Assembly symmetry: none
Homo-oligomer: 30 residues x 52
């Protein structure tokens, strides 16, 4: 479920992983 968001928060680890960037993108949807 939307706990994915809190997983996005952990995905906000690294925007040279772009897992943040993808998370910020996902937060750019969510």
């Amino acid at each position: 479920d939307e706990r994915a968001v809190e997983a996005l928060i952990k995905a906000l680890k690294d925007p040279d992983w772009y897992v943040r960037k993808a998370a910020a993108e996902a937060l750019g949807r969510i």
Copy 2:
């Protein structure tokens, strides 16, 4: 989801103001 909002508020309390920015943005979607 409300807890997700609460986590996003904690993401607005996240020492990395980068996160706070992303958190606010996510709360913009919400």
Copy 3:
């Protein structure tokens, strides 16, 4: 919940943090 808004008000701290900017964006939704 929408107490996030008041967290956005605190996020209005800094638009060279863009946490304001993201907050203003979030207020640009809310």
Copy 4:
């Protein structure tokens, strides 16, 4: 689908941070 989200969260736990990026992106769609 929620289990799919759960798997995508596990994809956010995927040792290949490439996957985490894709997973976050997928969760962006969702």
Copy 5:
């Protein structure tokens, strides 16, 4: 939310007229 409006009115009382602008804008959304 009404208290949120009340806070936004206090944001229209916020010494930083920048905030008042953002507050009015937020109240525009609302």
Copy 6:
């Protein structure tokens, strides 16, 4: 509540503050 409108009227102070402008925008919604 909608007393915000009357706060918008006070926000009509200054459109080089754009707090008027934002108020007129808010009145452009309200």
Copy 7:
């Protein structure tokens, strides 16, 4: 809200005809 309308009518009585314009516009929304 009706008192808000009454205030907006007083905003149509506001010496700054700029306000009257904004007030009429707001009453257009309403």
Copy 8:
């Protein structure tokens, strides 16, 4: 209340004040 309309009629004073224009706009809603 809708006595605002009759205030719009008085706001029809001046469309280089645009208080008429805003009134005609408001009548363009009302």
Copy 9:
């Protein structure tokens, strides 16, 4: 509101045929 209509009919009797136009338009909305 009916009196408002009556006033708008008087606005259709308004020596400024500009007003009559606006009045008819307003009655179009109504």
Copy 10:
């Protein structure tokens, strides 16, 4: 009331006054 319609009929005087045009518009609603 809808006697406004018969006032629109008198407003059909002049479509270079556009009071007809506005009347025809109002009849374009009514």
Copy 11:
């Protein structure tokens, strides 16, 4: 309103066939 219809029928008897057109159109709305 029925008398209004009767007047609109008289507007369909109006020597200006322009009016008859507008009258028919109004009766289209009705």
Copy 12:
């Protein structure tokens, strides 16, 4: 009343008067 319809039938006189056209429009409602 709906005798207007039979007046529309007489209004079907002329679609370069468009009183027919408006009648056909009115019959396009009726």
Copy 13:
């Protein structure tokens, strides 16, 4: 109205098949 239908049937008997078309169309509405 039924007599109106009867007239519209007579409009389906109207030597101008243009009318019959309009009559059928009107009966389509009805």
Copy 14:
């Protein structure tokens, strides 16, 4: 009355009269 339908059947004479077409339209309602 609905004998109009049987008049539509006779109106099905000609769809280059479109009295059929209008009849088929009327049967497209009826």
Copy 15:
């Protein structure tokens, strides 16, 4: 109306299968 249906069935017996099509369509409405 049932006789109308009976006529429409006869319209399904109408040598012009065009009519039968229209008749079936009309019976679709019914």
Copy 16:
């Protein structure tokens, strides 16, 4: 009456007559 349905079954003769198609449409209602 609904014996029309069984007439639709006979109308299911031909969908290059579209009397079937219209019948299937009528069965698409019935």
Copy 17:
């Protein structure tokens, strides 16, 4: 109608499985 259903069941026994499809569809409506 029940006999109509019985006929539609016979239409589900109709050698043309096209009909059976239409019959089932008709029974879907019913």
Copy 18:
């Protein structure tokens, strides 16, 4: 009667006949 359902079960023979598909549609009503 609803024995049609059991005929739908036999109509579940073939969804490249779509007699199943139509049956599933009919069961999508029933």
Copy 19:
């Protein structure tokens, strides 16, 4: 069903197979 997603996760094997790339594309939809 959406278990395809988890098949996309296995398709994330290889983006010189582009089965990942196509999976990331599919996750770029999903």
Copy 20:
């Protein structure tokens, strides 16, 4: 269609990873 998805998952199991790519792409559309 879900079986189609299941086949596409089998196409993600297709020894030709070319197919898997196309399959993933198709599942992207879906």
Copy 21:
């Protein structure tokens, strides 16, 4: 029906037949 997809999978035989290519194109829609 969408079994065409599985026919596209068989059409994925040959992209120097371009029947794969056309299939991949079709999967580029589907």
Copy 22:
């Protein structure tokens, strides 16, 4: 149309793989 799809699948069975290509392409549109 589904039979058309079935024919297009037979066109994917058409000995001329040129046709299969065109058939797949057509199914791409569909």
Copy 23:
């Protein structure tokens, strides 16, 4: 109707007639 498609399949006879080409174009729409 869409049996035209199967006529396009026969039109796939000859792309030095370009009746295939036009058919492939038509299938490039259909």
Copy 24:
């Protein structure tokens, strides 16, 4: 229009394969 399609199919049967090309093209539009 369907008869128009039927004629266009006959135009695909037109001895001048030039016409068939144009017919297919027209059916491409349709």
Copy 25:
């Protein structure tokens, strides 16, 4: 109406009349 198409088919007489060409152009729209 679209019987014009069949008139275009007759207009396909002659593309040194360009009445075909114009017809093919018209079929290049239709």
Copy 26:
């Protein structure tokens, strides 16, 4: 407009095949 089409078809019957060309072209627009 349909009569306009009918006239354009008569323009496709116009002894000057120049007109027929223009008529077909006009019907191309339509």
Copy 27:
């Protein structure tokens, strides 16, 4: 109205008047 088209047909008099040419241009729009 579009009777202008039939006036264009009369304007097709002369393309050294270019009233045809302008008509063909107008038909190049219409």
Copy 28:
């Protein structure tokens, strides 16, 4: 505007065929 068209048709009746050309051109725009 239709009267404008009527005037433009009269401009197609204007003794100066120069005007007719311009009129046709204007009707091309319309």
Copy 29:
């Protein structure tokens, strides 16, 4: 309003005034 067009028709007086030319230009827009 578009009575300007009829003023353009009077402006078609003189294309060594270029008031025609400008009118033809204006008709080259209108």
Copy 30:
């Protein structure tokens, strides 16, 4: 703006035909 058009028509009545040219040109834009 319509009054602006009316003024531009008066500019088409402006004794300086230079103005009329400019006025027509302006009405070309409009």
Copy 31:
């Protein structure tokens, strides 16, 4: 507002002031 146009008309005073020229340019936009 567009009363600027009427100011352009006064600006049409002088094209050795080029205030006309600039006005004609402005009318070359307006």
Copy 32:
């Protein structure tokens, strides 16, 4: 902006006709 236009009109009233030229030009942009 309208006040800006009003100022530009005052710039068309600016004793330096150089300004009027620039003002008209600016109003050309607007």
Copy 33:
């Protein structure tokens, strides 16, 4: 904001400062 325009008007001081020239350029955008 666009008060910059009125600052451009003051910048119209001097085109051997080219602050006018740049202003006229800016008005050449604005």
Copy 34:
């Protein structure tokens, strides 16, 4: 950005008229 405009206006107040030129130019872009 508006503050940026305000700064650019201050750049139009910049003692170096060189800057004012650049500022006006920048405001030209904006």
Copy 35:
């Protein structure tokens, strides 16, 4: 962010540094 502009204003220090020149260039974009 666009505070860069105000940094360009400080970069307007020196056009024998060309940091002004580059700033004026940047203002030649901004």
Copy 36:
């Protein structure tokens, strides 16, 4: 990217005014 702008502003603070020039230029692109 905004941090990139911030770095470019720091590049406008770069002791080598060569860099400041390049930085301003880069900000010109941005």
Copy 37:
């Protein structure tokens, strides 16, 4: 990502390496 820019800033080391020059070129794009 655009951190490349900050790498360009380090590449601004040396324009007899032309790594600055290439960086300035890259900033001449960025």
Copy 38:
């Protein structure tokens, strides 16, 4: 591609400053 950028940044770290030049240039394209 971002990893490609990362590699190009490593190419800006490439001991051969020749490469750094080429890398910066490539990043100029990007």
Copy 39:
């Protein structure tokens, strides 16, 4: 894919092979 770039980096081996030169050229595109 763009891993070609990293192959270009290896192609940066030798510009008396000109495989660097061609790589720098390719980077002169990429």
Copy 40:
């Protein structure tokens, strides 16, 4: 095409460094 790129990378692995040069050049185009 990506496989083509892969082959071109293998052409960058081609023992003839002449080919590698051509391959890099081809990848420059791509």
Copy 41:
């Protein structure tokens, strides 16, 4: 298709055949 490229790679056999040269030329396009 682009397998031609790999045929160009085989065409890179011989630049005293110039089939390489033509291939390098073709790669000078591709």
Copy 42:
């Protein structure tokens, strides 16, 4: 055209290496 490419590849297989040169050149165009 792809078959044309295939033929051109066969022209790259043409025993006359002259042809291969021309074929490669043609594929250069393509």
Copy 43:
């Protein structure tokens, strides 16, 4: 159509016919 290319291949017969040369020229376009 482009089968002309394969006719060019046959035209590659003879460059003392220059039908090859013209073909190579044509391939120098194609």
Copy 44:
């Protein structure tokens, strides 16, 4: 034009190889 190409191919079959040369050349243009 394609038939023109077909004729030009026949011109490549023209016993005068002079023509074939010209034909190939013409196909070069095409």
Copy 45:
């Protein structure tokens, strides 16, 4: 039309008529 080409083929009769030469020239365009 382009049948002129086939007339050029007949014009290829004679290049001491230069009607071939002019044809080859025309084919040197076509």
Copy 46:
């Protein structure tokens, strides 16, 4: 113009082969 081409083809039929040469040349331009 096509008739002009037709005349030029007749000029290719002009007994004076001088004309045919000029005609072909003219068709070269066209």
Copy 47:
């Protein structure tokens, strides 16, 4: 119009009038 061409054909009368020569020149443009 281009009937001038046919006048050029008559101008092909005489190239010791050079009216042919000028015509051939004009055809050397046309």
Copy 48:
């Protein structure tokens, strides 16, 4: 200009064949 062409055609009818030469030449330019 077309009338100019018409005059130039009359100049091709000018008894002085000198003029015809000049006229043809002028039409060459046109």
Copy 49:
């Protein structure tokens, strides 16, 4: 305007005035 051409035709009076010659020169442009 281009009536100058017809003035050139009158200027074709005399090429020992060279007003013809200058006219022929002007026609050598026109």
Copy 50:
């Protein structure tokens, strides 16, 4: 400029045929 042309035409009416020559020449430029 057109008036300039008109003056140049008057210069073609200038009693000094020297001027007419110069005027024609000037019109040659134009």
Copy 51:
């Protein structure tokens, strides 16, 4: 402006002043 031309016409006073000659030169540009 181009009124200079008419000043050139007055400059055509004297070609032993060469102010004509210079004017004719200027007309040799204009």
Copy 52:
């Protein structure tokens, strides 16, 4: 520049006809 032209016209009014010559020459450049 236009004022420059105006000055050059005054230079065509310069008592020294030498200047007028130079002025005309300068206007020749312009």
